[PDB]
Each structure stands twice: as structure tokens, then as C-alpha cells.
Design a protein around this ligand. Structure first.
Ligand code: SF4
Ligand code: SF4
Ligand code: SF4
Ligand code: SF4
Ligand code: FES
Ligand SMILES: [Zn+2]
Lengths: 82, 94, 125, 687, 206, 114, 47, 106, 77
């Protein structure tokens, strides 16, 4: 019972190039598909990108997206959402 | 002047009284509450206003020393008086 | 006759300070802000280390300010953030650090108060 | 590179042209005396105390005003400079009053310190002094005008920053004096900085009158919560009591200024305070009890509730630690209806892109902008220092400023277009006489406040603004490092809630009404018992009892911002933290500690034991809330607008008026400003 | 002038010459010789030159610095070697005084000089008790001014003024027990230092 | 980095100095409860010695260990020679004070103890 | 006094009091400053 | 002479007192004057040095002549504004004369 | 000004308590020898350096002059 997704990423670093690509490519489509889902884009400086996904009764998971490409990031995103 | 509170305690020159529900009233039991009965805020009011023929007047309190620093007060505002911040005296321009 | 010991330095067991006051604390390293009341800057030149404040209650007898923290009036002075932080680590305190907020250089032109075209023109001399 | 070699006691310095002797001395580290000079005001040559000597020159020059020529050598501890300082101090203290033991500017007196350092030790003035009639110019500022040294700092501050033009010098010679020729009152959103700026105790603060002396005060460094700017502040305590509040230089936010409200509302932290846990009686009355009783009862009523029936509402002045704890609790209970008392569109990308609901242009970017556009806002009373930077630009760098909304008294002159929103689409199309400006003007800015989004027509206007921003960006060329769109809040906890994942509004609570409310700092009155079941168990957590506490079932006293270490965030994403100055009164505690212990009791033991752990939780949820003092760029407005363009909602006819029209309403906007018995004096005086 | 202090340069000359003398005899174990405005001679040295230098000054015929007027320590917590150590020495044949300084820290002790001057037997114990600085080759080294169970070095700059513990008699156990410190009037910290520079001659550069 | 040592070259020699000191203490302990009429039992005293030793176990620096050995020797001197008293020795057990409860709740309920 | 009398001023004690270290009219200290923090009192009627 | 107090709450006494024995707390009086609400001295902290009457710019606090004021409790030596004002009213006929004697030396 | 006054220094011969006793006695005597001279040669004039940035000013000057009052305030705070 997923309740929230939150991507944490960086800028001007390789680790987050795939995540920026994902954001430009497929984020509007994801939102319009499931609009009532909270997707929290959160960028900072000198982090290692992660995707914290939070389920119903107070649990959540995470996966490092460092040195990952846009297609792999979309793979992990769909894995989580599924 | 010392005027007593419901509890029977005298009030001070700064309005201090242990609330009737206060446990700190014990220290006064079998004893007293030291209070000064001479209130400056009234003793100075009992004094009259000085009059001067000059729009500026210097106050020191009495003796050159034994008083307070010489301060100069303006008396252009006939609406009210000119008070000294040290001694409390007040002057007028006539 | 020399030895090599590269491990981090600690003197906590020699300072004699106790656990409550060596782990339950939080120290602050900073430059005291200038008092906007005055325009002097001879106080924003040395770094200072202080502690977190704690309970400060009222004595029932006389109304004074009573405490139990013996490090409330403890302020230390340093000439360098590196030395301040080294001392903090040495002693064993978790520290927060602030940067030296220096004012910016400003362009001043007494002539700007009399321009023929600009808004900087002043209405009272 | 257009630089000049100058000498200060022999040492060489590189300085830009137009730079002054004072500035060069400062660049070396030396510091010239001052009475009439201030970095942020115009220059005057009145005090005559900055006088120094130039090698090979008979006359001493004024360091505040003389731009430094090439090759000059400046002698600062020379006999001539020192004799000049001695004479000037002699003259200053000739006619000064001996009021130092009555003068609340006693241990802070620049005149005292400079007389001791650069002045002599005795008087040769055996004549009679003068005295001056003392004015009355408000309830905040006390005027003893026989201490004015005629420096003009007040006049200049007023004319330039506060845009008032009501102070001045009437008369000439020693008979001259400062103030208003009449009994006018000086009541501005910025009146109160003349106090810090007056080098002497001629202008003082009536509240702080006679209460303390500087060498007694302990000084902590904290931030404001009254507004959403985050003005850096100093809290000066004495024996565990808050005595006053001062500014603190942050040249990217406030630059030595703060607002009347946040410098004279420290009295509200001493009245109508919650000191003990309270609970409903059997007679419906509120009565005192202990933390054990209250927390156990709340946890009991929590163990029999979940989902949409449990809800949380947060008002202004609440801390991100408390927010994240309440979320990490109501999420283990599976009630995600965590809401704010202030609103932001839930449509479009809403709270999903930080590029939104922010001042994407740094508050300092107004000093580089060219055109500014204001939508439904009185920034003069909401975030006044934003208006202050706007006027600073309007003065120095010839800024253009326009306002869509009601006719308002901005401290400066502005272009007025109309009170209705349709001008937005009008502009975007091109049937307006403002496209002409926007076309020739680069670096534009368009800022919109939450006071217009509080309407029902909240998202339509915002989407119109977004489309207009796109059209402007494509018409007048701009890079992707210059930002255009900006959102401005009146609330200090908003950005934190939105970055922690709250629902910006109360629509969810009006949709699926709850049976168990956690209301925290919600002294607004938006929600009440006319919107809930007859048996809603409600827990009020807060530091004042104003609106939401009486209509409560359990009350848990908490700690204000002068009594806790806690993060807040301003309209530009700058995370800042307070520092405890005075421990809370009595049984009051910290909100995150309260919620943690509550969960431990219920059986939902959280993993947060210390503030560092709570901050690491904040880091995991959003990693920006621990990079204090640092803003973080954003680059996803194209996607934001791509999405927001698909949101059909029509605007309405009624204009968009600001709720704060006159200074009468700047005061009394939060529970602290309602508790302050000085803000009441100011309101009364205004009316 | 009647309000200012006289100023004799003969002493400055003598002491600068003797500084050069001492420094060229001991180019090792020596650094930062300085004679001040008020005509006092300081010689800073390395912790390995204590006994060499003290012996030289005591025995050398030109020096005869026999009396150990004082031994002291000084805590400056902003320098890696935070414990300055100071020996104030006196010579009667010349009616002269001198200062010999070295440095130390925690874990980095100094060599004892009871072999040279026996007065130090107690001064060094006092330094160890107050600033926490060990000395090598000291017969007895133990608490001298503080209580027997005192844990701390209180003349440092980080040790609080009022301390960490407090004593009182308790009838239950019939002894003088120790406890944490709870005062009925917290000592007040007066912030006095002025914002305006008072001595330019010491103005540090930025 | 490189340093100058004190009374040791490595933690092994340091630990054997420590073990000699423990021998001395452990052996002397009962003579104290005998000379000065302490109420406690030798078991309590020895447990206290063990506790005060393990309180400084994480230590790694030979110098920080040699200094602790020095100070323990000072204390043992003060104790075997009757310079300390019943009071100074019983100042180790804290018989007249309750400790700060190691419970978030037991702290919260009474004070701001973090 | 007989030859050099004092200055006749009111607010000066006419009747002298001796040491009262233990008498019932002795000195008991207290704080002269009023309450600082005023609490919140709710009304005496529910909802 | 009017009967008005002299202390204007300037705190120089509190700032110079070596033993930190003077606690002061002031306010504006209903008649608009600088006057104290609280003035406490601890005789178990005073070293009797006179710096307070050296500093007072108005001759309001004076270390008088009396020395026979021993007690039986430690709580009768914590003075306050009331006790000190009573002592002033008590001993003014002597303090004034001694000050008239000595004020030309200071 | 000890350089302006005469007195003898008693020295011993054996380093014993008796010699030190006699030394202290003769010191008590040389003290009278010095006091006679100090009295006879007492000069007039001020008593504290007239540098009001170190030593406070007199009270009349404090209560009539601005600079003296500022110096008093700063010196006692
Ligand atoms: S401003 Fe006030 S403190 Fe400063 S010299 Fe004037 S009277 Fe004294
Ligand atoms: S009132 Fe104060 S700020 Fe204004 S001119 Fe006078 S001294 Fe300057
Ligand atoms: S005489 Fe007593 S009260 Fe006055 S300053 Fe000296 S120690 Fe303080
Ligand atoms: S007693 Fe004198 S020095 Fe002390 S605060 Fe009152 S007036 Fe100032
Ligand atoms: S600072 Fe130059 S004349 Fe005032
Ligand atoms: Zn007067």
C-alpha cells in the first residue's frame, strides 16, 4: 500500500545525471497518470541519489541511484510503483 | 501608604503581595513582614512646584556635592511642568 | 625515541569532567555578532566557543536565579576556527560551527545626493 | 585593473576608485571614529569626527566623504588627527547632559567609548548648557532631545529606507533641534530601528525603559518567526528572562534591520501562557493534571482510531522537528491527513517541485532585477524587509515596479494596472501597455503572495501567472540562471511543512472529517466544532491559549521559539535554526519530545531520542533542512508549467485585495502579537 | 612628565646584549629572545633545554642567576602547545632578573629541575595539580593545594569557576558527602570588553 | 602523526603497568576497610575498582594510559598512607544521591534532561 | 546633640528599635518584584 | 530632604561589587521615574569595601557606621530595599553628619 | 621613594632563630627611623595620578563636568 515517493538527488554531479534525465523525460506523464500520489522531488548538494518510497503503516525502502542511467532509473521507479 | 490585602498582608511601595493561595506566607507566621511606610511617590507629590523667571533652570538637589549631577531643564511648555529625572522636583516658567 | 600514534586525540578521561557534562551537551563555535547599538568592530575579531543553555529557575526565598549547570558562564576565546574545533574534538564535545559573516564592500558617493537625473537625490542636507 | 595604490601608515593597499579614506582604513583593518556615518545611509559631513591627516597636506580631510586619490598616505594616529578628535569631542560634550546614569544607552554609548579612547579626560567648559523640549512621537520611541548630537541618522533612515519624509531639522545654530514641527507620530513598520541607529540615548525604546543594562545581558543568536523571511536576531536575557530583541547583520536577508513587530512583541511571551497539561473535567471544565495522565489518555484514545478518522493540523510558528515527528507518528497509525492552516494549490505539481512555493530569485536578487511585478500582496506589512530591499533597489539601481491588486501605500512610487486578475491573461496575450516595458526590460521578476491563494480562486490565478511567466521568458530573452516566478508567504512554517509533505489546506479535513484531531499552533479559527462529529477527541499543542485551546479536550503546553532549538525556513529555502535562550515556563516541554514520549506510551516507540537524530530524520525526508544558511538552486519550472497548463479553472470577478491594508493590521497577526500589551498601545495610537 | 613613567635605556641595552650573549652561547635550545618596554628580558626555549639553560644561568660566572623567584604555568587554549611554563630567576651579584619560558601540552611533559633549584619541589607539584602538567624525575608529585579525591585541573581555562561538585554534611550517613553543584544565585557573566580599539600599537592585521 | 612518548612505547607495556597497578590496589583494598571503619564489603570495594578501571578501557594512547597510571598511583599513595579519610573514599559510591534515570520518559516527566 | 543638634527631617525614626534577632518583630526576607509570567485561565463554562 | 529616594537604578554598585552581592531590578514607576523594584544585598557576601558608595553618583547607598547587627539565622542577613530604607531612615541623623565631615576628602 | 630615605639592614652571623629575632627587632626600629623622615618630609599636592582614564575623578568634578562623569561610569563598570 504505497503512500508516498520521494526522490533525493543532486546537481552538477555524475551520480544524478540519470535522475535529471528521468525528471525531464518521465515525470509529467507519471503525475498525470497517478495525480493523487505525492512525488517529492528534493535536490541538494553532494549527496548520493536515493528513492525513499513510503508504504501504508510506517515503513519505507530506499535504493541508491548513483552512476545509474535514465532507463535504469525508470526501471527502478516502475519496480517500486509495482 | 501601606494598605492591607484580603489575606491581611501589607502592600509595599512596589505592589508585592503573596497571593492568598501562596505557601510562601509561612515565613511570616509568628513573625512580621518588614515594610517601609514612607512612600516617596507621595512624599515628593507633597512638595510644591518651583517657579522661575528663566526658561532654562539648573538642578543639583541642594549642596553642590551631596546632591546629584547638575542637570538643565527647559520650561518652554507652559502646558506641564519641568521635572528632574534625579530628584523628582518640578519647575515652572511663571 | 619517537613513537607513532596516529589515532584521534582524546583527553576526556584526564579532564575529569563527567559523562553528563561531556556527552549530554552541545557546543557552539562562532563570532559574536556586532551590537547594532554600537559601530565598533573590535569584538568581531576573535572566535568564541560557548555551550547550550539550561534551566535557570527562581529561588523561593529571595527570587534569585538558580542553576545546576556549571558551564553556563563558560566562554572560550580563539584566534582560529581550526584551533577552536581541535579543542572541541580534543575535549569530546559535539559542536556546531558558524561562519564569519563579513559585511560587503559598498560604493559611497557624496555626490550622488545631488544628481540631476537619479533618485538618490536627497531632500534634506 | 582600474585599482589604485594607497598608503595607510605606510602600508600599501589596492582600492577601487571612488573609495574613501575610511573604507581604505577598514580594508587595512584600522577603523576611523564615527558619529554621522553608516554604511547603509547617505553620507554627511556633520560630526567632523572622522578627520585624519594626509602626508603633505595642511588641512585635515573627512574620511567619510573624501574619495581616496592615488599616492596619498594617511596618518591615523598623528598629532593633528588626534587633536582634531579631541576638539570635536570637547565640543560634542560641551552641551551634553550628565544623564549617563539615567540613560539606557549607558553601557552601549559610542560617545562614551570614543570620549574614553580618542577624547580628553576633563572639561574646560565653565559656562551654561542648554536644554530642549522633549517631543512625543509614538508609544514605542522615547525622545529625550537634549541628548541629540545632530547626526541626522534618523532623518536619513526615514527618508531613504522607510520612505516617510516626516523628520527634519527646524531652526539653525545651537538653537537648532531635530524632530517634527508638530505633534506627529512616527509609526511605521520599520520605526524601531532609529533606536539602534541613534548613537546616543536621545531615542530609546519605551518597553526596555530602565529594565536592565548591557553588561548584565546574555546574548543568544536566533531568528524571527513572526514573518517568513527569517530575520537574524539577537535575544538578550537577564537571570532567565527575555529583556529585548535586537537585529543581527545578515547582508543577504535583512542587513541590520528588523520589524517593529519582532522587536516589540517579546512581551507576548509573558502572557496567556500554557504552563501545565490540562484536561476536560466531567463538568466539561478544563482542569490541571500531569503529563502521565494526559499522555496516557491521549494514547488510549489513539489506540482506538486510525485512517481518515485521525487528522493533524499545524499553524504558523511550529517547528520542522515537531512536524516530522507528528508525521512519523500519524503514518505509523496510517492517517496521512496532515494539513496546514495556510493554503497552497493542491492542483498541478503542487508541493512536488521545490521550484514552486519559493522565492526562486534570492531575496538579494532584487538588487540585480530590472522590473518587479507584485500580485495580490502588501509586502510593506507582510515581509516588510522584502519591500525594504525593493526600495533600496528602486533608489540605487533605478528599479521599475508594478503592482496588480488594490491601491496600496507602498513606501515608494509604483505603476498601477488594475485590481482584477484578468490583466494576467491580458499581458500574456499582448493587449496591454506593460508588454512594452517587459519587452525592452531584461531580468524581470514576478512575485505572488499566499494572501491571494487563500481565496477560492487560488490555482487559476497561479496558473495564469505561470503562463504569463513563460510568455515573458520567451518575449524578453533571459537565461536559465535568472529566475522570474516567485511565491511569498506570511507563514514561517509553511515551506517546512511543504518540504516535509503536508497537504497545504484544510480541504481534506472538510472532506473526510476526523474523530481525533492533533491541532498544533492553530490559533486561527479556520476549523472549529461546527465542522466535526459531536465526539471529536482534540489535542491542542501550543504555547498560547488564544482560539483553539478553549475548544480543546486535552491541552499539552509547549515551548516558543525563544525556548527551543528548532529549524525554520524562509520563502527562499534558507534553513535556519534558533538557539535556546530561556527554558520553558513550568511544565512546558519541547514539542518533539512530547510527541516522542506520547508514541512511546502508546506503543509506537519512535526511533528519535535526540535532536541530532531528529535532524538526521529531517535529512532523510528532505536533505536541505540541515544545510543551514545555504540556498539550493532549482531547475524544473519547465516541467512545472508543462503540467500546470492542463488545469482548467476560471478566475472570478471580485478583485484581489490584500488583508493588510493599513499599519493598523500589521500588528496583531499571531497569538504572540495578540498577547502583547504593547501592540495594543500601537493599534490604539494609530486609530 | 609627572603622570608618565620614566624610561631608562641603559637597562634595555644591557639586557639586549645579554640576550645576544645567551642566544649565541646556546643557539640550540633557544628561540624568541625579547626585551620589553619596561626593561624585562624573556628568553623562550625548547622543552629539551630546561636543565642546560638553568644550569648555565646559575653557574656561569657572568650570570650567577641563583634564586628561583618563581615557577608558573599559563593556559592559552588556542595554540597546540597550550601550557606556557615560566621560570622567573634572580641574580644578586648583578641585581638582575630574567624570565625563561618554554611550552607544553597534555601528554607532553617537562623535565624537572629539583637538581638545579630545590625550590621547585613544590612549585612543580602545584603546576601538576592546577594545570595538569607532568614532570619527569620528580621524587614526589601529588595533590598539594586541592582535596585528596579532587578530579580535575582547575586553573585551566575550560574548568568552570564554581566547579563540578559541592560538599555538605548529611545526618543519615554522618559524613561530609559530595554532590553536584546547585547554586541559589548563578554567577553573573558581565560582558565588558569594548567594541572600540584602545591600543593601535597592538592592532593585528586582518 | 609521530609523537614523543611517556613511560611506554606501546599499549602492551602500558597494559602491564596497568596490571601491576591493579595488583597493588586489589591487594591493598581490605586494609582500608579495616583501618578506617567503612561499612562496605571487600566485594563491593573490588567491584568498584574493576568498574573504575573499565571506565577507561576504550583508551588507546600509551600516553593517556601512563598518565592514568600515574594518577592511580597518586591515589593509592594517598590511601595506603592514611591521608584520605572515610569521607574521601566513600565519595566513590554516591550513597546520597539518585542518578539521572536512563529513560527518555523518566527524564521528560520531571525535567528538560536530554 | 545638646549643642550640635541633628537635622530635623521627617521620615526619620522618632522611636529607636534595638536588635530583634529573635523577637517576634524581627526581619523576614522576601522578593519585592511582582509576578513575571502570567498564566492562562480558561472560562468557567464548557463549550 | 523631600523624602524621595535617591537610587536611580544605574547598577554601578552591582557592577563594581567584587563579591557579586548586589542584585537589582528596576522599572518605570507610575509617576514616570527611574526607580527600583528590587534591591538586595547579601551580607554573607559583602566584604565591606565601600566601592558601592564610591560609585553611587547620587550618594544613595552608604556603608554606615553601625557594626552591632548580628543575628541568629542566616536569613536575617539577606537584606532588601525595605530593610535598607528602614536603616537609612534610622541612621540618617548620623550618616548625614559623617558625610558632611568627610565629603571634602573624596 | 625609598631611595630618598635612610635606614640600616641588620644581618646575622649564624643563621639561627635568635639572629632572626634580633633582625626583626632591629627592623621594627629602622621602621621608626624611616617614619620620622617620612613625616618630616611629607610633601603637599595631589594623591592620585590626574589621569582620569585610570584613577576616578573627584565627585564635584563628576557632578559638574561631562567627561569626568563618563570616566567615572566607565571606570566603575
Ligand atoms: S548618550 Fe547617554 S550615556 Fe552617552 S554620553 Fe550622553 S547621557 Fe551619557
Ligand atoms: S536623534 Fe539620534 S539619530 Fe537623530 S540626529 Fe539626533 S543623535 Fe542622530
Ligand atoms: S561594600 Fe560590600 S556591597 Fe558595597 S561594593 Fe563592597 S562588597 Fe559590594
Ligand atoms: S545604589 Fe547608587 S550606584 Fe547603585 S544602582 Fe542605585 S543609584 Fe546606581
Ligand atoms: S563620520 Fe565624517 S563627518 Fe561624521
Ligand atoms: Zn534634581
Amino acid at each position: 500500500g504505497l503512500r508516498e515517493i520521494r526522490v533525493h538527488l543532486c546537481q552538477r554531479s555524475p551520480g544524478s545525471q540519470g535522475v535529471r534525465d528521468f525528471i525531464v523525460q518521465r515525470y509529467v506523464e507519471l503525475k498525470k497518470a497517478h495525480p493523487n500520489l505525492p512525488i517529492l522531488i528534493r535536490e541538494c548538494s553532494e549527496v548520493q541519489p536515493k528513492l525513499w518510497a513510503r508504504y501504508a503503516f510506517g515503513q519505507e525502502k530506499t535504493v541508491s541511484l548513483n552512476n545509474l542511467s535514465a532507463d535504469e532509473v525508470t526501471r527502478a521507479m516502475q519496480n517500486v510503483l509495482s | 501608604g501601606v494598605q492591607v490585602s484580603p489575606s491581611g498582608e501589607k502592600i509595599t511601595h512596589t505592589g508585592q503581595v503573596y497571593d492568598e493561595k501562596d505557601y510562601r506566607r509561612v515565613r511570616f507566621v509568628d513573625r512580621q513582614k518588614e515594610v517601609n511606610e514612607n512612600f516617596a511617590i507621595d512624599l515628593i507629590a507633597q512638595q510644591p512646584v518651583n517657579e522661575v523667571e528663566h526658561r532654562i533652570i539648573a538642578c543639583d538637589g541642594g549642596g553642590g556635592a551631596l546632591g546629584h549631577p547638575k542637570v538643565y531643564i527647559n520650561l518652554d511648555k507652559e502646558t506641564k511642568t519641568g521635572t528632574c529625572g534625579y530628584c523628582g522636583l518640578q519647575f515652572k516658567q511663571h | 625515541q619517537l613513537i607513532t600514534v596516529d589515532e584521534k586525540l582524546d583527553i576526556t578521561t584526564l579532564t575529569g569532567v563527567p559523562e553528563e557534562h561531556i556527552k549530554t551537551r552541545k557546543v557552539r563555535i562562532f563570532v559574536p555578532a556586532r551590537n547594532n547599538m554600537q559601530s565598533g568592530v573590535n569584538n568581531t575579531k576573535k572566535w568564541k566557543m560557548e555551550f547550550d543553555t539550561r534551566e535557570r529557575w527562581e529561588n523561593p526565598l529571595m527570587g534569585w536565579a538558580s542553576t545546576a549547570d556549571p558551564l553556563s558562564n563558560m566562554v572560550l576565546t580563539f584566534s582560529a576556527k581550526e584551533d577552536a574545533i581541535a579543542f572541541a574534538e580534543k575535549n569530546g564535545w559535539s559542536y556546531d560551527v558558524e561562519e564569519k559573516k563579513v559585511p560587503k564592500p559598498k560604493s559611497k558617493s557624496y555626490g550622488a545626493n545631488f544628481s540631476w537625473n537619479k533618485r538618490t537625490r536627497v531632500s534634506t542636507k | 585593473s582600474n585599482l589604485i595604490e594607497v598608503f595607510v601608515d605606510g602600508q600599501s593597499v589596492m582600492v577601487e576608485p571612488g573609495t574613501t579614506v575610511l573604507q581604505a582604513c577598514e580594508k587595512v583593518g584600522m577603523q576611523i571614529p564615527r558619529f554621522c556615518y553608516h554604511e547603509r545611509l547617505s553620507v554627511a559631513g556633520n560630526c567632523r569626527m572622522c578627520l585624519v591627516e594626509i602626508e603633505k597636506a595642511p588641512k585635515v580631510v573627512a574620511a567619510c566623504a573624501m574619495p581616496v586619490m592615488k599616492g596619498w598616505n594617511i596618518l591615523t594616529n598623528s598629532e593633528k588627527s588626534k587633536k582634531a578628535r579631541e576638539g570635536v569631542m570637547e565640543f560634542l560634550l560641551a552641551n551634553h547632559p550628565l544623564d549617563c546614569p539615567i540613560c539606557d544607552q549607558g553601557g552601549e554609548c559610542d560617545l562614551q567609548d570614543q570620549s574614553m579612547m580618542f577624547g580628553s579626560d576633563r572639561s574646560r567648559f565653565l559656562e551654561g548648557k542648554r536644554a530642549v523640549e522633549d517631543k512625543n512621537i509614538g508609544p514605542l520611541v522615547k525622545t529625550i532631545m537634549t541628548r541629540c548630537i545632530q547626526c541626522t541618522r534618523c532623518i536619513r533612515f526615514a527618508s531613504e529606507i522607510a520612505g516617510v519624509d516626516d523628520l527634519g531639522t527646524t531652526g539653525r545654530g545651537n538653537d537648532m533641534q531635530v524632530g517634527t514641527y508638530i505633534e506627529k507620530m512616527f509609526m511605521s513598520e520599520l520605526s524601531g530601528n532609529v533606536i539602534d541607529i541613534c548613537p546616543v540615548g536621545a531615542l530609546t525604546s519605551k518597553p526596555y525603559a530602565f529594565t536592565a543594562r548591557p553588561w548584565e545581558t546574555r546574548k543568544t543568536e536566533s531568528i524571527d518567526v513572526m514573518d517568513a523571511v527569517g530575520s537574524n536576531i539577537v535575544v538578550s536575557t537577564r537571570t532567565g528572562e527575555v529583556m529585548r530583541i535586537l537585529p543581527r547583520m545578515h547582508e543577504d536577508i535583512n542587513e541590520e534591520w528588523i520589524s517593529d513587530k519582532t522587536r516589540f512583541a517579546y512581551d507576548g511571551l509573558k502572557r496567556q501562557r500554557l504552563t501545565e497539561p490540562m484536561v476536560r473535567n466531567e463538568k466539561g471544565l478544563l482542569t490541571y493534571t500531569s503529563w502521565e495522565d494526559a499522555l496516557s489518555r491521549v494514547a488510549g484514545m489513539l489506540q482506538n482510531f486510525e485512517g481518515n478518522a485521525v487528522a493533524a493540523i499545524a499553524g504558523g510558528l511550529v517547528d520542522a522537528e515537531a512536524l516530522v515527528a507528528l508525521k512519523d507518528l500519524l503514518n505509523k497509525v496510517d492517517s496521512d491527513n496532515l494539513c496546514t492552516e495556510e493554503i497552497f494549490p493542491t492542483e498541478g505539481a503542487g508541493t512536488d517541485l521545490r521550484s514552486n512555493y519559493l522565492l526562486n530569485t534570492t531575496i538579494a536578487g532584487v538588487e540585480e532585477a530590472d522590473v518587479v511585478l507584485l500580485v495580490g500582496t502588501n509586502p510593506r506589512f507582510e515581509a516588510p524587509l522584502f519591500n525594504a530591499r525593493i526600495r533600496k533597489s528602486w533608489l540605487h539601481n533605478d528599479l521599475k515596479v508594478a503592482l496588480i491588486g488594490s491601491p496600496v501605500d507602498l513606501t515608494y512610487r509604483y505603476d498601477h494596472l488594475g485590481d482584477s486578475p484578468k490583466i494576467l491573461q491580458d499581458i500574456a496575450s499582448g493587449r496591454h501597455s506593460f508588454c512594452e516595458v517587459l519587452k525592452d526590460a531584461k531580468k524581470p521578476m514576478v512575485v505572488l503572495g499566499s494572501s491571494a491563494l487563500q481565496r477560492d480562486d487560488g490555482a487559476a490565478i497561479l496558473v495564469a501567472v505561470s503562463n504569463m511567466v513563460q510568455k515573458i521568458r520567451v518575449t524578453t530573452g533571459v537565461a536559465a540562471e535568472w529566475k522570474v516566478m516567485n511565491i511569498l508567504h506570511r507563514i514561517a512554517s509553511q515551506v517546512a511543512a511543504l518540504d516535509l509533505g503536508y497537504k497545504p489546506g484544510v480541504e481534506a479535513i472538510r472532506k473526510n472529517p476526523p474523530k481525533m484531531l492533533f491541532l498544533l499552533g492553530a490559533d486561527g479559527g479556520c476549523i472549529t466544532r461546527q465542522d466535526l462529529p459531536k465526539d471529536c477527541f482534540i489535542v491542542y499543542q501550543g504555547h498560547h491559549g488564544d482560539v483553539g485551546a478553549p475548544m480543546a479536550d486535552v491541552i499539552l503546553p509547549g515551548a516558543a521559539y525563544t525556548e527551543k532549538s528548532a529549524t525554520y525556513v524562509n520563502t527562499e529555502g534558507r534553513a535556519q535554526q534558533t538557539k535556546v535562550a530561556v527554558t520553558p515556563p513550568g511544565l512546558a516541554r519541547e514539542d518533539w519530545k512530547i510527541i516522542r514520549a506520547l508514541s512511546e506510551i502508546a506503543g509506537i516507540t519512535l526511533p528519535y531520542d535526540t535532536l541530532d537524530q531528529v535532524r538526521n530524520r529531517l535529512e532523510e525526508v528532505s536533505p536541505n533542512l540541515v544545510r543551514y544558511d545555504d540556498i539550493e538552486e532549482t531547475n524544473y519550472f519547465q516541467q512545472a508549467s508543462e503540467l500546470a497548463k492542463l488545469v482548467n479553472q476560471e478566475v472570478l470577478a471580485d478583485p484581489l485585495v490584500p488583508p493588510q491594508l493599513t499599519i493598523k493590521d500589521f500588528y496583531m497577526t499571531d497569538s504572540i502579537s495578540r498577547a502583547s500589551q504593547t501592540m495594543a498601545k500601537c493599534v490604539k495610537a494609530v486609530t | 612628565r609627572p603622570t608618565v613613567r620614566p624610561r631608562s635605556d641603559v637597562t634595555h641595552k644591557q639586557l639586549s646584549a645579554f640576550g645576544e650573549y645567551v642566544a649565541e652561547i646556546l643557539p640550540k635550545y633557544v628561540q624568541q629572545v625579547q626585551v620589553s618596554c619596561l626593561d624585562e628580558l624573556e628568553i623562550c626555549i625548547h622543552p629539551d633545554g630546561v636543565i642546560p639553560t638553568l644550569t648555565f644561568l646559575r653557574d656561569h660566572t657572568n650570570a650567577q642567576f641563583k634564586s628561583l623567584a618563581d615557577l608558573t604555568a599559563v593556559d592559552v587554549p588556542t595554540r597546540q602547545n597550550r601550557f606556557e611554563i615560566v621560570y622567573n630567576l634572580l641574580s644578586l651579584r648583578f641585581n638582575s632578573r630574567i624570565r625563561v619560558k618554554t611550552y607544553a601540552d597534555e601528554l607532553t611533559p617537562i623535565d624537572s629541575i629539583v637538581s638545579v633549584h630545590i625550590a621547585a619541589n613544590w612549585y612543580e607539584r602545584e603546576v601538576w595539580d592546577m594545570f595538569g602538567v607532568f614532570f619527569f624525575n620528580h621524587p614526589d608529585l601529588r595533590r598539594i593545594l586541592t582535596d585528596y579525591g579532587f578530579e580535575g585541573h582547575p586553573f585551566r581555562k575550560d574548568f568552570p569557576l564554581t566547579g563540578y561538585v559541592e560538599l555538605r554534611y548529611d545526618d543519615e550517613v554522618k559524613r561530609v558527602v559530595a554532590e553536584p553543584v546547585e547554586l541559589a544565585q548563578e554567577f553573573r557573566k558581565f560582558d565588558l570588553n569594548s567594541p572600540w580599539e584602545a591600543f593601535p600599537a597592538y592592532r593585528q592585521p586582518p | 602523526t609521530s609523537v614523543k612518548p611517556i613511560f611506554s612505547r606501546d599499549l602492551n607495556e602500558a597494559k602491564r603497568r596497568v596490571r601491576e597497578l591493579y595488583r597493588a590496589w586489589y591487594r591493598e583494598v581490605p586494609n582500608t576497610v579495616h583501618l578506617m571503619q567503612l561499612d562496605i564489603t571487600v566485594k563491593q570495594g573490588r567491584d568498584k575498582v574493576r568498574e573504575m578501571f573499565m571506565k577507561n578501557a576504550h583508551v588507546t594512547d600509551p600516553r593517556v594510559v601512563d598518565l592514568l597510571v600515574i594518577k592511580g598511583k597518586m591515589e593509592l599513595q594517598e590511601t595506603i598512607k592514611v591521608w584520605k579519610q572515610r569521607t574521601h573514599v566513600m565519595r566513590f559510591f554516591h550513597e546520597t544521591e539518585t542518578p539521572r534515570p536512563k529513560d527518555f520518559l523518566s527524564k521528560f516527566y520531571m525535567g528538560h534532561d536530554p | 546633640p545638646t549643642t550640635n543638634p541633628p537635622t530635623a527631617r521627617k521620615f526619620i525614626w522618632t522611636n529607636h528599635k534595638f536588635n530583634v534577632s529573635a523577637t517576634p518583630e524581627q526581619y523576614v526576607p522576601y522578593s519585592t518584584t511582582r509576578k513575571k509570567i502570567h498564566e492562562w485561565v480558561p472560562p468557567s463554562t464548557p463549550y | 530632604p523631600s523624602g524621595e529616594e535617591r537610587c536611580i537604578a544605574c547598577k554601578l554598585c552591582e557592577a563594581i561589587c567584587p563579591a557579586q552581592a548586589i542584585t537589582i531590578e528596576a522599572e518605570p514607576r507610575a509617576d514616570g521615574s527611574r526607580r527600583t523594584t528590587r534591591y538586595d544585598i547579601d551580607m554573607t557576601k559583602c566584604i565591606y569595601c565601600g566601592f558601592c558608595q564610591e560609585a553611587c553618583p547620587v550618594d544613595a547607598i552608604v556603608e554606615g557606621p553601625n557594626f552591632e547587627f548580628s543575628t541568629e539565622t542566616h536569613e536575617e542577613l539577606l537584606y532588601n530595599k525595605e530593610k535598607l530604607l528602614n536603616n537609612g531612615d534610622k541612621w540618617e541623623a548620623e550618616i548625614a553628619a559623617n558625610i558632611q565631615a568627610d565629603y571634602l576628602y573624596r | 621613594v625609598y631611595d630618598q630615605v635612610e635606614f640600616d639592614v641588620p644581618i646575622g652571623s649564624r643563621g639561627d632563630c635568635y639572629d632572626r629575632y634580633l633582625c626583626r627587632v632591629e627592623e621594627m626600629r629602622q621602621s621608626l627611623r624611616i617614619i620620622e623622615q617620612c613625616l618630616n618630609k611629607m610633601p603637599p599636592g595631589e594623591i592620585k595620578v590626574d589621569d582620569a582614564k585610570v584613577s576616578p575623578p573627584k565627585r564635584a568634578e563628576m557632578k559638574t563636568s561631562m567627561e569626568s562623569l563618563i570616566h567615572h561610569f566607565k571606570l566603575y563598570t
